[PDB]
């Protein structure tokens, strides 16, 4: 019946209400408690919404469009869910007066055809004009770091952010290629950029391992299985018919491993890593040969080492071929972070890097880790996509303007629908002001003054509350966000409003 | 005041124990004997009554 349509609209409001404070870098965060009891807190709407698992069928549409938003684009997963839900809230009083849903849903796609042609007119392609290679990455890095605790220390952080993307291919860039590990303790300005990978220092036990950490050209080799003798967990029982034979029972592993001890010496590999915990048998012979090794290496850490020197993993140490080996330029393990952490430097073939951060608490670094990801996604989409538009409410306020004038020239019921479509676009700049504390009543009223003077670049200043231009604030967003969001929000809005019945089978 | 040489008294202005002879705080002696003699006879009337029958409610 008709009552199912209204019930489906209010069901999405409860999900949308939680995603409203998550819009913007300064907005509130959602605390989600998984059934596994692991607590995760982040401002990225993708991972957030994926943890809800709402039983309601129409709420699954928001999850489906969130995956395509994070895959094809990666930015704006929160805004695409709020914009798709806002159109359903404004259409609630229109359905109570007898207006069919088909006319309202059809009117939304009418403004989409005018929105696609509007984005192409607002897209300006500029690369080397009034800019350079270093000035492009430097000016855009301080924008995402503004209004944060790192703004005073951002001078040293921008220099490390520019060299991060230069170490990787400009045609193909991935934000996951730069790792960030939380290191408790130390100053936040003492962090450095490393091309290699670091470990967690999981060994708190003392009494061995003397060795200098300064190496010239170590050789890297991967080992798929654990080679060890001493084991802290399990144990071996020996019962036989002879008294003097109790010793030799546990020695069955000697000969074949005894030969493998000198195979590394003949090979010369100075780096040995494995995804399984390694005992003290491997660390024994490696001392004199100046061979470095680390046990209990994560699975994701070895995959980054394979792509570093171009080597490959092998099960045993016998049949390893010479092309599996690799060598870096320098290996230096310093005390940065008040603990010795191994790292690689000088790998020309390395397809990934790691950006280390320091701070007095792990929660402070977590706020910086999510803030650095926003600056990477801007550069990630500024390379492949040459169309750059003014974001932060600039383009959002421009789309609503022109659509109000196009409705006056369109006779019929589409006039109120397009006018309501442009009116619902005001939720994006509003919520951004409420999350930062600014008053959305006065700004949205005063912004419409200069907005009608013909200048389409007027944005919203995120630092000090006032009307201004995002061109001077260096707030940029790719044109792919505005194109993919309007197409996904319109399809998701027309899908839920057309539901006349909710069928759920139990058993 | 336990043993000897105590002129101290209760001073409500400063919230502490001060000498009342310097501030000039005195009370009538007739009021002292009247209250003690009345309170002593008042306590005897209630104690000398072992059982109290409920009065007729009006």
């Amino acid at each position: 019946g008709k009552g199912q349509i209204i019930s489906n609209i209010n069901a999405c409001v409860a999900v949308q209400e939680a995603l409203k404070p998550t819009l913007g870098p300064l907005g509130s965060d959602i605390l989600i408690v998984t059934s596994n009891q692991k607590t995760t807190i982040s401002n990225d709407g993708a991972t957030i919404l994926k943890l809800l698992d709402v039983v309601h069928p129409a709420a699954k549409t928001l999850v489906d469009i969130s995956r395509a938003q994070d895959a094809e684009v990666g930015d704006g997963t929160t805004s695409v869910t709020i914009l798709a839900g806002e159109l359903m809230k404004e259409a609630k009083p229109f359905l109570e007066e007898g207006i069919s849903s088909h006319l309202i849903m059809k009117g939304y796609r009418k403004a989409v055809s005018l929105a696609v042609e509007k984005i192409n007119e607002l897209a300006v392609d500029i690369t080397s004009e009034k800019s350079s290679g270093r000035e492009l990455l430097e000016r855009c890095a301080r924008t995402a770091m503004s209004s944060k605790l790192i703004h005073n220390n951002a001078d040293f952080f921008v220099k490390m952010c520019v060299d991060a993307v230069l170490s990787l291919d400009r045609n193909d860039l991935d934000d996951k290629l730069i790792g960030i590990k939380k290191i408790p303790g130390g100053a936040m300005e003492e962090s450095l950029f490393i091309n290699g990978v670091a470990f967690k220092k999981t060994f708190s036990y003392a009494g061995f391992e003397q060795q200098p950490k300064k190496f010239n050209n170590p050789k890297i080799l991967s080992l798929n299985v654990e080679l060890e003798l001493k084991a802290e967990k399990d144990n071996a029982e020996v019962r036989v018919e002879h008294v003097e034979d109790y010793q030799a029972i546990v020695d069955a592993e000697w000969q074949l491993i005894f030969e493998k001890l000198r195979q590394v010496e003949e090979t010369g590999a100075n780096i040995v890593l494995s995804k399984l915990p390694i005992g003290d048998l491997a660390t024994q012979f490696f001392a004199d040969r100046n061979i470095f090794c680390a046990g209990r290496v994560s699975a994701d850490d070895m995959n980054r080492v394979i792509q570093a020197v171009g080597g490959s993993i092998q099960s045993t140490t016998s049949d390893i071929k010479p092309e599996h080996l690799g060598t870096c330029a320098l290996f230096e393990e310093m005390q940065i972070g008040s603990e010795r952490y191994n790292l690689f430097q000088g790998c020309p073939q390395a397809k990934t890097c790691t950006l280390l951060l320091r701070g007095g608490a792990e929660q402070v670094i977590a706020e910086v880790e999510r803030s650095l990801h926003d600056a990477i996604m801007i550069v990630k989409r500024a390379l492949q996509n040459k169309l750059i538009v003014a974001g932060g409410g600039a383009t959002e306020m421009e789309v609503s303007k022109c659509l109000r004038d196009y409705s006056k020239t369109i006779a019929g019921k589409q006039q109120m629908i397009i006018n309501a479509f442009a009116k619902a676009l005001e939720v994006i700049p509003r919520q951004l002001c409420e999350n930062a504390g600014f008053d959305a009543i006065e700004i949205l009223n005063k912004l419409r003054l200069a907005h009608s003077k013909g200048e389409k670049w007027y944005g919203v200043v995120f630092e000090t509350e006032n009307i201004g231009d995002n061109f001077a604030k260096f707030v940029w967003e790719p044109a792919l966000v505005k194109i993919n969001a309007l197409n996904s929000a319109t399809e998701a809005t027309n899908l839920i409003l057309s539901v006349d019945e909710t069928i759920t089978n139990k058993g | 005041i336990y043993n000897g040489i105590s002129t101290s008294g209760l001073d409500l202005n400063n919230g502490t124990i001060a000498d009342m002879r310097q501030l000039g705080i005195v009370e009538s002696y007739k009021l002292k004997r009247a209250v003690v003699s009345s309170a002593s006879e008042a306590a005897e009337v209630l104690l000398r009554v072992d059982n109290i029958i409920r009065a007729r409610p009006r």
């Binding site: - | 209250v35 209630l46 109290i52 409920r54």
Partner: protein
């Protein structure tokens, strides 16, 4: 309940004018059924006589306080406050003994002579 009405019942009535002792003492409102005839005052003898008391033990305290007003007329509230404190100490002596208070009364006469 005979001694309880003369102790707990008297202390509950005695604590009404107990906080009004002294110029810095507390105050109490006296409300009637219609509530529009009420008044506020610091007089201890007025509060006791105005409030209707169904306790037959509390009616005796009203007649005792009238002796101080006719003989002298000063410190009437202080008599009720001091008499209420004597019942607090006498209540602890009885329940821990359960002996006739007349023996305890004889102890008050010997102690009052040393106080004068």
């Amino acid at each position: 309940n005979a001694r309880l009405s003369a102790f707990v019942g008297a202390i509950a009535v005695g604590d009404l004018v107990k906080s009004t002792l002294g110029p810095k003492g507390m105050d109490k409102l006296l409300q009637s059924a219609s509530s529009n005839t009420c008044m506020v005052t610091n007089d201890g003898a007025t509060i006791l006589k105005s409030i209707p008391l169904d306790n037959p033990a509390a009616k005796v305290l009203v007649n005792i306080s009238k002796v101080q007003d006719d003989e002298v007329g000063d410190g009437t509230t202080s008599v009720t406050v001091l008499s209420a404190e004597l019942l607090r100490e006498a209540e602890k002596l009885i329940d821990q003994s359960k002996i006739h208070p007349q023996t305890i009364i004889e102890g008050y006469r010997l102690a009052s002579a040393a106080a004068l």
